[PDB]
A = this chain, B = another copy of it.
Amino acid sequence: AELDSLLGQEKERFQVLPGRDKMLYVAAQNERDTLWARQVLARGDYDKNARVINENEENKRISIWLDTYYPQLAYYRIHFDEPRKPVFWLSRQRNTMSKKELEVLSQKLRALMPYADSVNITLMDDVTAAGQAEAGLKQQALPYSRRNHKGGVTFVIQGALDDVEILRARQFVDSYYRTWGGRYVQFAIELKDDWLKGRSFQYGAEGYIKMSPGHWYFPS
């Protein structure tokens, strides 16, 4: 009784890989599928060793290991489009490493992932990342403010946003994050009340609001 025969009729929904530790690794695409697989193993239908894995869990585990042995490495995300040959994106500016060091890092990652034959390290540009973030916000015509820090960029999107805006923003943010992760660029969405509706006011260098005839409010 092979494992593929136990996962279902939809054969290609899942992918089975052999691990050097003598254990089978089932690759899933999402949480629902992950639990569909895990139920089979937890029921104990299969007698050999097996494990279920997915991209988000593996990204978390590897980041926890890097936190301990490489606490100063600047990197983005690991892609598992081809689970036998993952791709690891490092920052070109915020790291200095020699080729020897990169190779050693490669081999240690390969030792953490017993189902991968090799790990390809690629250097990416921060300016590109930041630029694609700003271009996407402009293309969506959202209002925003940009703040630059030594190690990161923050976009603040705050105000009386509309439903259509909230929807567009959510879709965009979720698209970007799945590519670049959340380490270098951060987005902050902040709904707040409207003070101007139905009030007279002066705007520009010397603005103030008329709370009512006879009452002047000066903002900061």
Knowing A139-B151, A139-B154, A215-B143, the reply to whether A72 touches B128 (Cβ < 8 A) is yes
By a CB distance below 8 angstroms, the chain B residues around A68 are 79, 81, 87
Q: Which of A9-17, A93-101, A102-110 contacts B (4 or more CB under 8 A)?
A: A9-17
Docked-complex contact A141 and B164, CB < 8 angstroms: no
Q: Mark A49-89, 1 if CB is under 8 A from B, else 0.
A: 10100000000000011011001100000010100000100
Query: Is there a chain B Cβ closer than 8 Å to A30's Cβ?
Result: no
CB contacts under 8 Å to B, within A131-172, are 135, 138-141, 143, 147, 149-152, 154, 156, 159, 162, 164, 168
By a CB distance below 8 angstroms, the chain B residues around A154 are 139, 141
By a CB distance below 8 angstroms, the chain B residues around A159 are 215
Shortest C-beta distance, A202 to chain B (Å), equals: 11
By a CB distance below 8 angstroms, the chain B residues around A44 are 9
Shortest C-beta distance, A27 to chain B (Å), equals: 16
Shortest C-beta distance, A23 to chain B (Å), equals: 8
By a CB distance below 8 angstroms, the chain B residues around A196 are 216
By a CB distance below 8 angstroms, the chain B residues around A189 are 164
Shortest C-beta distance, A74 to chain B (Å), equals: 12
Q: Of B9, B81, B128, which is within 8 A of A65 by CB? A: B81
Query: Is there a chain B Cβ closer than 8 Å to A190's Cβ?
Result: yes
Residues of A in contact with B (beta carbons under 8 Å apart): 9-12, 41-42, 44, 49, 51, 64-65, 67-68, 71-72, 79, 81, 87, 128, 135, 138-141, 143, 147, 149-152, 154, 156, 159, 162, 164, 168, 179, 186, 188-190, 196-197, 215-216, 219
Least CB separation from A44: chain B residue: B9
By a CB distance below 8 angstroms, the chain B residues around A152 are 135, 139
By a CB distance below 8 angstroms, the chain B residues around A138 are 149
Least CB separation from A145: chain B residue: B141
Docked-complex contact B42 and A9, CB < 8 angstroms: yes
Least CB separation from A141: chain B residue: B154
By a CB distance below 8 angstroms, the chain B residues around A140 are 186
By a CB distance below 8 angstroms, the chain B residues around A41 are 9
Q: Of B49, B72, B141, B219, which is within 8 A of A156 by CB? A: B141
